[PDB]
């Protein structure tokens, strides 16, 4: 913040709900709690300029957890190949994936 009134006075008007890893009602952690925590603890201390290069792995994991682009790519590719193989006639959907399974408790 431009003027650090809150840090100066020791109060926390709005600094406690900045990210997904902050305290949630009834201790229900948000999606990607672990990833965000890792990224932020990695990036503490070192400046932003250094973090942008030295916490990149953590940030990449975090964005993957939150948006999930690569997961969508992977599932799309798997189901695309499934469709191609099925149209060719070289694959069958197993019983458990088809609709009849031995349902587990």
């Amino acid at each position: 913040p431009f003027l650090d009134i809150q840090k100066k006075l020791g109060i926390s008007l709005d600094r406690h709900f900045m990210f997904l890893s902050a305290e949630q009602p009834y201790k229900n952690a948000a999606r990607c709690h672990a990833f965000e925590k890792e990224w932020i603890e990695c990036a503490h201390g070192i400046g932003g300029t250094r973090a942008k290069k030295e916490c990149k792995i953590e940030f990449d994991d975090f964005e993957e957890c939150l948006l999930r682009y690569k997961t969508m790519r992977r599932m799309h590719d798997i189901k695309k190949q499934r469709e191609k193989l099925m149209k060719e006639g070289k694959y069958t959907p197993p019983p458990h994936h088809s609709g009849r399974e031995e349902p587990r408790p």
Partner: protein, 98 residues
């Protein structure tokens, strides 16, 4: 989520476009602004529900409150311009050109 966010961003874009190009009635422009408000609230709501971030669900309601306050101010201004000119046409709002 992805397709929904794309369509919502397009909706906000269209409402912004509608606001930027007028069409005589100031009330319609106010309604376009109000529609952008709707789209932004929906964006925030879906983002929060997707992330399960219940600490950020206090914020769409603040968006609604402040958008309502500004919309009320806009309506009052419409009342005043109407009292001045007899209509809400934006053409009449041209005195300050000089």
């Amino acid at each position: 989520m992805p397709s929904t966010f794309f369509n919502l961003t397009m909706a906000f874009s269209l409402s912004l476009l509608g606001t930027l190009m007028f069409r005589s009635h100031l009330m319609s422009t106010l309604l376009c602004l109000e529609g952008m408000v709707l789209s932004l609230f929906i964006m925030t709501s879906v983002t929060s529900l997707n992330s399960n971030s219940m600490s950020s669900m206090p914020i769409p309601i603040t968006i609604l409150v402040f958008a309502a306050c500004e919309a009320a101010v806009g309506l009052a201004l419409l009342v005043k311009v109407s009292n001045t000119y007899g209509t809400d046409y934006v053409q009449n709002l041209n005195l300050l050109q000089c």
